[PDB]
């Protein structure tokens, strides 16, 4: 009689997985987006008799850090990272997070920032001259040229801080900025250290890694699974309703 | 169901992006025009179940889940680059280099 509960739980988790897939498909064009992997997880109920009821609860692993594809925009301050590079920026709460959205912008007061959040380098957030043109090197050097001044006065005015996370130990926070897991940050320190083995490319921008074939296959599988679970639900309901009349005289 | 109200946001973002592209293509002959480029952002994620214990002498994958919320058009930037110069031979036409605007 309780198989209806297992079937409805499976249906609800299928709906959750469908919602995850729809979320991945919707923002398929945001720059520097990481897809949200998902896979059903089994939980067996048991004890003292005939362990048969095994429930299903959907779960989502961290992400797939497969690099997104690069498109050339020729904008001087667009950065594309290596296989597993990250740019570290302070978040709203004041803590640091990691991202790959290379669409840097400069405010009216010489404040560099990715969308919403300022970029950090040596020390606090990096600041450039008031209206200087900015060029980004292949290793993170920010060269500034004051307008009108002759070209022979290009000066380095700071440096980006680049970290290296392999991917299995980073988890997406509530605002889309990745952070190290508990054990990873315990064993590598609260704040990561800059490394030179990471190189950027100026002028190109990174998209998102969403697989249309994977999305379509998951949608088809979820549809079929949900329909099967619904059929099991109605069969069990009809069986119980027909059998309920035994108590009569 | 959240799927409908997520795909609605996806469709809206796509429609606005198409409108921006159409606007850029419409004024392909407007003098002194700077092209538009629309950038979006994913909404804040909603967590349901926190991840459990990990690396406990086992090779299990994490168990937590968090559903998305959709995508919103966050900004639209105009590329203030340098365009080409067309010769009109009219004595009262001015083409400005570098950066600057007439008040």
């Amino acid at each position: 009689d309780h198989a209806i509960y297992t079937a409805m739980g499976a249906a609800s988790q299928t709906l959750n997985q469908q919602a995850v897939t729809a979320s991945n498909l919707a923002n398929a064009s945001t720059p520097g987006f990481r897809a949200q992997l998902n896979a059903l997880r089994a939980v067996p109920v048991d004890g003292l008799s005939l362990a048969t009821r095994t429930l299903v609860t959907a779960s989502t692993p961290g992400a797939d850090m497969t690099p997104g594809q690069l498109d050339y925009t020729s904008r001087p301050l667009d950065v594309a990272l290596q296989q597993d590079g990250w740019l570290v920026v302070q978040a709203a709460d004041g803590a640091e997070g990691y991202t790959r959205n290379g669409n840097i912008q400069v405010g009216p007061t010489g404040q560099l920032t990715i969308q919403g959040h300022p970029v950090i380098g040596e020390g606090g957030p990096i600041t450039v001259p008031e209206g200087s043109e900015i060029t980004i090197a292949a290793d993170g050097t920010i060269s500034a040229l004051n307008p009108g001044d002759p070209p022979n006065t290009v000066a380095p005015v700071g440096r980006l801080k680049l970290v290296k996370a392999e991917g299995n130990e980073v988890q997406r926070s509530d605002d889309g900025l990745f952070r190290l897991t508990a054990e990873a940050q315990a064993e590598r320190g609260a704040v990561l250290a800059a490394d030179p083995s990471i190189r950027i490319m100026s002028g190109v921008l990174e998209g998102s890694n969403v697989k249309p074939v994977e999305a379509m296959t998951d949608m088809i599988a979820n549809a079929r699974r949900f329909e099967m679970q619904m059929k099991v639900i109605t069969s069990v309901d009809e069986n119980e309703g027909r059998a309920n009349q035994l108590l009569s005289m | 169901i959240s799927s409908l109200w997520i795909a609605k946001t996806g469709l809206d973002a796509q429609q606005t992006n198409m409108d921006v592209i159409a606007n850029n293509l419409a004024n392909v002959s407007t003098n002194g025009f700077k092209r538009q480029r629309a950038v979006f952002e994913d909404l804040l994620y909603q967590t349901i179940r926190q991840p459990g214990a990990q690396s406990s002498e086992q090779t299990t994958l994490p168990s937590g889940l968090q559903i998305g919320t959709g995508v919103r058009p966050v900004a639209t930037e105009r590329l203030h680059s340098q365009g080409n110069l067309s010769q009109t031979n009219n004595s009262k036409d001015v083409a400005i280099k570098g950066q600057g605007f007439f008040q």
Binding site: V45, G47, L48 | -
Partner: peptide, 21 residues
């Protein structure tokens, strides 16, 4: 005891954990 029979001790509670520690 065999299923469906009588017993003098209550069954232990059911837990069904998501992931064992």
């Amino acid at each position: 005891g065999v299923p469906g029979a009588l017993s003098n001790q209550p069954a232990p509670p059911n837990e069904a954990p998501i992931a064992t520690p």
